[PDB]
Amino acid sequence: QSREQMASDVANNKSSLEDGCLSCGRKNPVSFHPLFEGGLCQTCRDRFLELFYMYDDDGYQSYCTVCCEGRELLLCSNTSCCRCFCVECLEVLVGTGTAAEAKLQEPWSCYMCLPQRCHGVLRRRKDWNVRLQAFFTSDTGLEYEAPKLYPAIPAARRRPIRVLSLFDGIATGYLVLKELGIKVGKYVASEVCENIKYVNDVRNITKKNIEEWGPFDLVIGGSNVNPARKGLYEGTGRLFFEFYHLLNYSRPKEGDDRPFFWMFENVVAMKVGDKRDISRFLECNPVMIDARARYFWGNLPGMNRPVISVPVIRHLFAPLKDYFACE
Amino acid sequence: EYQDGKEFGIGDLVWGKIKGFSWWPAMVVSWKATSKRQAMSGMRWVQWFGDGKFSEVSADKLVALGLFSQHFNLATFNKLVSYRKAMYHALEKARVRADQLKPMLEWAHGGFKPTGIEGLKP
Amino acid sequence: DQSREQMASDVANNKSSLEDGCLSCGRKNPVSFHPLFEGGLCQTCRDRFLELFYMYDDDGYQSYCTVCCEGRELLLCSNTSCCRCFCVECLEVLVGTGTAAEAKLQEPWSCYMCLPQRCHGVLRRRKDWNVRLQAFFTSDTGLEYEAPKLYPAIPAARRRPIRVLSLFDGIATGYLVLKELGIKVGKYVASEVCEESIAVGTVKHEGNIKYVNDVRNITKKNIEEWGPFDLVIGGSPCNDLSNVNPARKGLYEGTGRLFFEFYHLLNYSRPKEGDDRPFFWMFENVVAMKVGDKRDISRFLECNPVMIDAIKVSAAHRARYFWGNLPGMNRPVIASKNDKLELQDCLEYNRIAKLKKVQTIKNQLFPVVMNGKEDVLWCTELERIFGFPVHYTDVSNMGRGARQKLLGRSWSVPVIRHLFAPLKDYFACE
Amino acid sequence: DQSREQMASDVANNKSSLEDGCLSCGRKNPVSFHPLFEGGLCQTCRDRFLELFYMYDDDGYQSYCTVCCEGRELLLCSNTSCCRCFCVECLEVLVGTGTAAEAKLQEPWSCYMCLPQRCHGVLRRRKDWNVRLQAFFTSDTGLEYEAPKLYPAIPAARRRPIRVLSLFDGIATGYLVLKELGIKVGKYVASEVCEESIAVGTVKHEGNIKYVNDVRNITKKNIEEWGPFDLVIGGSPCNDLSNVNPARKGLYEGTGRLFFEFYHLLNYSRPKEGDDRPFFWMFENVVAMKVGDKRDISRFLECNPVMIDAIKVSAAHRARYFWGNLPGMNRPVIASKNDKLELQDCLEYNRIAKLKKVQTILFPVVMNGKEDVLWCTELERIFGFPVHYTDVSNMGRGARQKLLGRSWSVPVIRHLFAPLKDYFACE
Amino acid sequence: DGCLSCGRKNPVSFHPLFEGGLCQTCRDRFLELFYYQSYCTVCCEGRELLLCSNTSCCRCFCVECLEVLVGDWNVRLQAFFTSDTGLEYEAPARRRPIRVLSLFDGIATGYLVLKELGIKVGKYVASENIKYVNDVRNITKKNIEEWGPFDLVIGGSPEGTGRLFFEFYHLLNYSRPKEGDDRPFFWMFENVVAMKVGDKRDISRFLECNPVMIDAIKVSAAHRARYFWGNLPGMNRSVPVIRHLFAPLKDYFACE
């Protein structure tokens, strides 16, 4: 069916807006549009999971906020709201190009700023800040078990922590552990090339080195004009698999019940096939945290609790105080 | 290069918009002239006037200087010497394309009559 | 950083040895030796010789120069059974100026590996090039790992049938080879998504193979449901790993990521600590790939590969890398008495083979003459070339293209048999 | 020249018998009998029944009406292994008015050849149709000729290997049958111009067949150079004699002229007068052809044909006409112990056959719960050939199926050639 | 080595009309449709027809052939239309009267020409003193044996040419004298030149004798051209044609 057919039906008020693809007009939707009132088709929802969170170097939205396909973008003059809208969306979902005709005459505020009003067959849904959150980090074709919770330890038998790291920032995980007053005293750093025991070229670390330098108690990792748009065209395969290999090396053997925590970090703007691969290999599901949206895999205690990027890492690492000795 | 099906090729003059800034004139250049560039797919390489820096923004959100009156800033020009200097350079470049900025400013505000905007082509 | 002319002058004037400079760029401080001629090789020329030596054209000829592996124009050798081609500039600076034009009009021109060896200036052909070409490709790597530990022998009374897990099964070469050796099979699980390979493996072996779904849907619990396993084998797709693809994504991307599925599922099925039952595995890939990818695969699997060419047991060139811990993997290859070692033994009635050993799958239409006319190879002759039973792929209405495609990416029976042979001393036979 | 309704009323009123009129047009003066039902057939309706009773549709269903072979709308039978279709006007005038609409809503409808026999008015199915149907085609011809002259027996010490000439050889079924029978072949000259069939006969029989050129370039001197011959066989192409061709030129025209090459070269190799050596021949053609040509072929060949259906010894329908003078041509056909008589005996591993006998050559096979078609190695078993027989010269499903589709049938020829072992050497 | 009627390259033949090459398909249709056809003589184009019936000037140039060409006639034309592509190398008192079997009775053309020769005719057996019985379809070996022996067989024609040719072949094969005999036996066929090449090749192959050409342009004033077959003496050298062919047969027949 054509996009005008759905608008005609809505103007007749003879159907619901969740019967076709709001971005393409194709029927048989698979999910719901998290912002407006409409359905999402199968091929039109995969593109929404990648490009919806992409900002260019200008600080403005890269693609359309409705169809995520940009050919001629009109801008939101209001600051702290960098949304941009398409050129045919404003003529099909509003009714005509009258808004476009009046768009360039004066500075314009987008549809996410002005008080809610049904500007035709396009209705800003009342609540979006929650179902948008539930749209991304849920509704996936995998289901795993909750991680095993280690029992807490009394402070009379607490020892300093031992950290192996592979973050982008060499010392990013060192300062955070110092602001919390946790007993540092073992720290090995590295990087993916092309008390801190810095060693470059992670290609040089062997199993025997992990055996001698260990045992470890926390393994972390995950890390130029357009750092946000070059990510899709480059790929993140190299960064994940060396972290996975070293996590396999350092993981406690069978019959050992000592605590062991890990965490992986990645940005949201990535292809739909990589998230499934990481979830399958790591045997868990991510939780998004908004400060720059980011995914987080791991087994740290209380990882999906509500918020009460140094602050984000501090929030994530806070519940570690009751396992390892402080000060 | 830049034959990706989009408009606004090499040598064109367009406007721009930067967070924390205002509309600024820019010059489309090639990646070879840039100190470090690779001709990113789907975007364009521009160079600001009065600063000399190289910027690479997408082509979709680009607007030419045809509507000069629709992208003017009197307060910014009055309160910033750099804005007036950039306006003077833009006016001089447009005139050569074929506080003394008042005559060419009135020339631009009138719509480039009778020559129009056809003389801005490379 | 001198030139080739200076090095040639120095060696000709009896003032230097050939083993101090690089034959391909005339540099110094070489790290290895040229396997074919006398001399040395610098660091950046091994990584060009290692990847590009075995690449071949669609016309059954070598693609690059035999000396430098980088040619602007090539002089093809005219004699058959030798498909080498030499470089334009590699001659006049090494054998003598003005020789390219003289040899160009010569007919039939013979390269320097065919005719009886003569010291044409600085082109001194080696006496034992065959012995050293194996050592160039098998040894002198980056890192070295500890040898695998042997398992204690088992007496003939306490042997059990073998249980096998096979990833990227194909047309089930492992089952066929294990049955031809007389080993008693207890179970055989196969993972495959092609609908014609499943047909071949179900029709030909009477449904003794338990088929499963795509490899990306196998979970932790499935391994324990189906196991325990005694042999895990697999060969990953090399579509995005070879140099023949100008748009190769390499490892970590595309279809080259499927090595990590084998790596992931091999760790699940491995025996736990404190267990001592025998466990064997094997992985296979091509030789025409980047040195970084090979050095990474060796790093993850913790072993160096062995290079085996099928030319020593059959009638085709097919060189592959093998990782594994099977016993006696690097013992010398010796042919058998029932191996069809030439193209004539693999032809039908009233057909004459002009060649003796064909290239892998008047160049592609010139292997066979029949009734005074040039012909091509039949499917039943490719089946004999690879070592399969005749009429093995006559299943499910597929024609010449599908059968040739299925045979072209398979393993080689006389090589897998050579590798699996020493397994009979560990599992029940007959 | 009355119509059908008056005849039906007369027979219903118990004043006439069905054997006095033609069930297809209601006329009088019958000349034969309806093979299936009770009644008689007029002169002009037999010439339409004979040409069309065996024609079949691409959908595995009978092409024309079963009773009159002339219909406007067809009512296909629903029972499997029954492809019969009836005639709309044939129902209401014979069984009773008001049945065409009633039966159209019947599910699953079964024809009168399926349900137990009953006199549905005047439609009385015969109780021995399988016997008189055979005699309808074999006997009751136009003219009659004399009996063949049997040759005296030969003692087992004075027998020699056989010499064979074959025309339009195909994929050499005669050589395969003769070698399977145990007879000893001293020569086999085959004429064929297809490049893929020559490859099959060369590779499979190790070059014992001597191939020659087109049949139109063989002269009088060649026959006496290659002769003498003791058996001369052949079968002409049927691309211009069957009724499946809307633009068929028939005999005397087109590619149907190739029959007269067989008749011409049969005279050259025939023994001269005053000679007493055994000599045999056999010509073969399809049954679904014009009646006018059938009496013409018999006139030239001087003998009447026999009709053998491959359904009694195989798993397919294929009816053919055989001319010749072989000893014991018309003896009853009996199956052997090694004949795969049902479709399930000709299938690969893990396949289930929905049918049991296939029509003339997505339905037949269901594999893993999904419908499928027959493979190339399954059509070889149905016709009797050894498996992997046509796996030669890179051809696929398109070309292998064409070679098998126009060939002979091994059990039929083995039935015909069996009594040839009493005149020629064996082992 | 270039074609003239068609102009196609790789030519190995020549146009029979005059100088100019003939392609593979040009010569095939050159002798097939030679003979009022609205086809050109040189270009062999049947697209546009021009009318010209002047005395000794009937070659009307084709309209499309005006730019194609403009922009041994009595020696080579005869040879090309009688050349033997297949060489069948075989040239062959007080006696009894003549008895003849015939086909295509028509108006009994044989009876009067046999009677006018001065030799009495014994028995005439038509199949279409005249003894007409029935059609060819009702003749058996017993009928031939009852009415035989015979002396000569005549048949021919002035939807095809095979339906009667093969019947004549069958009847002649029946009527042929047995092997090892010296009794005289003659025969001849008759058909018009306007025929397909396959028909001519098949007829020449079955009778084992190459045809000869007889044209009425030298004995009459109408375009009657006929191919002939037979073993009568005199072809190697319209009722007058049959009169000429029947004149010499008095040598081997009754002369006391």
Ligand SMILES: Nc1ncnc2c1ncn2[C@@H]1O[C@H](CSCC[C@H](N)C(=O)O)[C@@H](O)[C@H]1O
């Ligand atoms: N995702 C996947 N899961 C299971 N098998 C796959 C797969 N992707 C590709 N394959 C199979 O892996 C095979 C690699 S070719 C190797 C074939 C095999 N080594 C042999 O002995 O013949 C291909 O035939 C393909 O069918």
Ligand SMILES: Nc1ncnc2c1ncn2[C@@H]1O[C@H](CSCC[C@H](N)C(=O)O)[C@@H](O)[C@H]1O
């Ligand atoms: N002009 C010709 N000369 C010789 N053979 C011919 C021919 N025209 C057709 N044929 C062959 O005659 C065959 C008739 S189909 C009959 C096949 C054969 N009787 C069998 O037992 O299988 C065809 O395969 C065709 O190849």
Ligand SMILES: [Zn+2]
């Ligand atoms: Zn859509």
Ligand SMILES: [Zn+2]
């Ligand atoms: Zn849009």
Ligand SMILES: [Zn+2]
């Ligand atoms: Zn806004």
Ligand SMILES: [Zn+2]
């Ligand atoms: Zn070098």
Ligand SMILES: [Zn+2]
């Ligand atoms: Zn070179």
Ligand SMILES: [Zn+2]
């Ligand atoms: Zn050589």
Ligand SMILES: [Zn+2]
């Ligand atoms: Zn009738």
Ligand SMILES: [Zn+2]
């Ligand atoms: Zn009917």
Ligand SMILES: [Zn+2]
């Ligand atoms: Zn029925």
Ligand SMILES: [Zn+2]
């Ligand atoms: Zn010509």
Ligand SMILES: [Zn+2]
């Ligand atoms: Zn002309």
Ligand SMILES: [Zn+2]
């Ligand atoms: Zn003239």
